[PDB]
Amino acid sequence: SRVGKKLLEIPSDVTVTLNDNNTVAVKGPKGELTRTFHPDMEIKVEDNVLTVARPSDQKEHRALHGTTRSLLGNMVEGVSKGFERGLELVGVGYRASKSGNKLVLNVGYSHPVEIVPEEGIEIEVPSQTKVVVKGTDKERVGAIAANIRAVRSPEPYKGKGIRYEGEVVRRKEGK
Amino acid sequence: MKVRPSVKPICEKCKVIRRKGKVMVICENPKHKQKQG
Amino acid sequence: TTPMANASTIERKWLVVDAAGKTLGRLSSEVAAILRGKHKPTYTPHVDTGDHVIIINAEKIELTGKKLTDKIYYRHTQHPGGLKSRTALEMRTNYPEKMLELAIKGMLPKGSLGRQMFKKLNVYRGSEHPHEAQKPEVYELRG
Amino acid sequence: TKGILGRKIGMTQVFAENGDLIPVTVIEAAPNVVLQKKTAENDGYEAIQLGFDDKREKLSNKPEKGHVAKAETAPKRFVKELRGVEMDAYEVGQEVKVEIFSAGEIVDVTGVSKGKGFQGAIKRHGQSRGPMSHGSRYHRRPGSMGPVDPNRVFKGKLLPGRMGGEQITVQNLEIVKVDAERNLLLIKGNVPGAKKSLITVKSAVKS
RNA sequence: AUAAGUGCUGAAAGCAUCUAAGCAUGAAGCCCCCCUCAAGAUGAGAUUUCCCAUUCCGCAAGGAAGUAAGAUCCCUGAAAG
RNA sequence: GGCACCUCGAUGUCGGCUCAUCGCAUCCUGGGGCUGUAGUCGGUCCCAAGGGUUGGGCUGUUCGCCCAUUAAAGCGGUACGCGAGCUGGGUUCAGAACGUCGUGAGACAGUUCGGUCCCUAUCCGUCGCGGGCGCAGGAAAUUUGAGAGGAGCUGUCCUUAG
RNA sequence: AUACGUUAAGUGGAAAAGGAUGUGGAGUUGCUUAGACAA
Ligand SMILES: O=C(N[C@H](CO)[C@H](O)c1ccc([N+](=O)[O-])cc1)C(Cl)Cl
Ligand SMILES: [K+]
Ligand SMILES: [K+]
Ligand SMILES: [K+]
Ligand SMILES: [K+]
Ligand SMILES: [K+]
Ligand SMILES: [K+]
Ligand SMILES: [K+]
Ligand SMILES: [Mg+2]
Ligand SMILES: [Mg+2]
Ligand SMILES: [Mg+2]
Ligand SMILES: [Mg+2]
Ligand SMILES: [Mg+2]
Ligand SMILES: [Mg+2]
Ligand SMILES: [Mg+2]
Ligand SMILES: [Mg+2]
Ligand SMILES: [Mg+2]
Ligand SMILES: [Mg+2]
Ligand SMILES: [Mg+2]
Ligand SMILES: [Mg+2]
Ligand SMILES: [Mg+2]
Ligand SMILES: [Mg+2]
Ligand SMILES: [Mg+2]
Ligand SMILES: [Mg+2]
Ligand SMILES: [Zn+2]
Secondary structure, X not given: OHHHHOOEEOOOOOEEEEEHHHEEEEEEOOEEEEEEOOOOOEEEEEOOEEEEEOXXXXXXXXXXXXXXXXXXXXXXHHHHOOEEEEEEEXXXXXXXXXXXXXXXXXXXXXXXXXXXXXXXXXXXXXEOOEEEEEEOOHHHXXXXXXXXXXXXXXXXXXXXXXXXXXXXXXXXXXX | OEEEOOOOOOOXXXXXXXXXXXXXXXXXXXXXXXXXX | OOOOOOOOOOOOOEEEEEOOOOEHHHHHHHHXXXXXXXXXXXXXXXXXXXXXXXXXXXXXXXXXXXXXXXXXXXEEOOOOOOEEEEEHHHHHHHOHHHHHHHHHHHHOOOOHHHHHHHOOEEEOXXXXXXXXXXXXXXXXXXX | OOEEEEEEEXXXXXXXXXXXXXXXXXXXXXXXXXXXXXXXXXXXXXXXXXXXXEOOOOOOOHHHHHHOOOOOOOOEEEEEEEEOOOHHHOOOOOEEOHHHOOOOOEEEEXXXXXXXXXXXXXHHHOOOOOOOOOOOOOOOOOOOOOOOOOOOOOOOOOOOEEEOOOEEEEEEEEEEEEEOOOOEEEEEOOOOOXXXXXXXXXXXXXX
């Protein structure tokens, strides 16, 4: 596992605490993330460098080693820099608006679609055609962004819908 | 989705994968999406 | 000359078995034998020589493989199209006592005496049982 | 949940304000009494036991008299439980009157349906007759008992037997009027049972 | 709670990948919700209330006899048959 | 169709009627992928058996064609389900006739008109309804719900919006 | 039961052409710290 073997530098502003049963808590300026890992993995912290060690070269271990390493890296990056996903509303009359904590989507349905973010996730609407999902947990930022995109996934005849920023929507010619 | 006994690359961009103990082809071309069945 | 146990001679102990982390079938086969009295040298086929068994932590019984999802408990109501089904996961969550009872019942003799032997089984979801009065000993499974 | 026990008096009709003619069932429900409060601690579930219709002392027994003693009421002919009610609202001995309901409120009405005695498959199960002519000797019989292969009749082959006398709930009936003076509910439409039979009127479960 | 399907994060396999660990979503279908029966559920459950510890043999075991609360026979009937 | 293994001291045979029940290779409705999917429609494949799945004309018919509907007018199994449940139009006794073949008696998966469908339910099974005992005293009520059954279909219009 | 392996499919405990980075054991061979392969 090239990925697993890679060493993780912890920024000065992030504290990683290893608790019982391979539960790692990572604290930084943007918040705290706690996660339990598989017992077999050996997570060491030495001189601000996090290292992950696999007990054997068994299929499961080689896979787990890379995953554990990647998740810990995402936790450290998440509490320091955070994760942000950007969505672009493409369509005539398609608009996003923030109502308190709720995202309100007007995407050509007979009713507005409201999305309530989970705890630890902020939704920003910098423009009526742009939505930014921000948070510490990469998985959660991704899940919510997918939830938003699902309201009206991009269609191919005119690319209308909610897309990821920079998403190459496959296009078919109509008439 | 093509559900067929013979799942194979149709083009060069097709990629054979395994999900839930089922052989599949994923591709950027959606016509080439295949699942063994 | 071969001695035969009878209702006068037989003396039944109470045993507690903890089901926590035990494989359903492996626990069941040992309990079934205890209920039958196969562990007693006075074992007699035509009478119930076995011991009473309390099972606690029945919800914490384990199944190997994908049996939680894929092991199906069928029953038929005797009405047309009356086959009902529950998964092992559904059984363990909602009907853990029935799950153990079903496992053990299938391993006991069939007939009047086998049905009588099953009456000495008592299965419980959690850690506690109400048979303090019967003064039950802990029984570790041999395995 | 709200509820009350009454007797079915009969049917009549009422002109609404807009001039529509509504068929109504009249239910006379003299004040019900809470005889007992069942609790999750004692009984394993929450319910109130309503007593209705004062019985003569001769027709009562010592078990009955002792049971109604806490409520401080005469022995009751009809006793039924309501579940899903607010336990703190009720107390033993409290009267439950028809004015718990109001006009416009949607109710479910439970009663025992009228007895029809032993009835054939045509009446009981709504089955079709065979032909009345064209050589037919098959009029009101219940049809084939089933296929050959099982060597037996399946359960649920519907046959003649005792019809009616079954508990029936009719859902989503409207209260037209509540006569608190005469202890009457006027309910729109028809409800199960003979005149004088016990009717339970409850707030609608689907509302 | 799921099916097909759609995913998120994610390595095995520096990438990619809905899957291996982990986390979602998703059918008139499944389990409930709604209606009815139901403790012979011999695993015979629960709650409230009532009666109250009688007289005889028989060494006791047990049996017999009057009864209590309560119910029935019989009778008037129908909303039941 | 092949075979000739059960039944010739009899296992009634087509179609309809009555009553269904099961499979899913799904006709409709529900959820989807791909589309040579602009939309409205469709095509194709995947999941799905919960419920639903028409009245007529002709013919003994099944089938089929046709008329008019329908969301749809599914395909199969159950002794080509069901005659001790019904029918008996057809097939398949005795009468008669036509064509045809035969010297003839007669014969014909050729046709035609007419032609007896028995049974008081013992057992299991099915649907109802009682009696008994049980349930560690005897009673009167109210009940929990293991478990079981039922229900489960769908159109059109208006609005969103020309 | 013992010992050493294999299988993750309840395969075991029905079914073929064909399809497939399933996984175990052998062997051949190209390229590679004169820096491969991935990015
Ligand atoms: O011959 C009869 N039936 C026999 C059994 O004895 C059998 O069931 C059968 C029925 C029909 C058939 N046919 O149509 O060719 C042949 C035999 C009597 Cl029911 Cl008449
Ligand atoms: K009982
Ligand atoms: K024969
Ligand atoms: K169906
Ligand atoms: K007949
Ligand atoms: K017969
Ligand atoms: K029999
Ligand atoms: K198997
Ligand atoms: Mg091919
Ligand atoms: Mg008719
Ligand atoms: Mg007649
Ligand atoms: Mg049989
Ligand atoms: Mg009881
Ligand atoms: Mg054949
Ligand atoms: Mg031969
Ligand atoms: Mg014979
Ligand atoms: Mg299918
Ligand atoms: Mg037939
Ligand atoms: Mg028959
Ligand atoms: Mg001639
Ligand atoms: Mg002939
Ligand atoms: Mg139940
Ligand atoms: Mg039963
Ligand atoms: Mg098998
Ligand atoms: Zn391709």
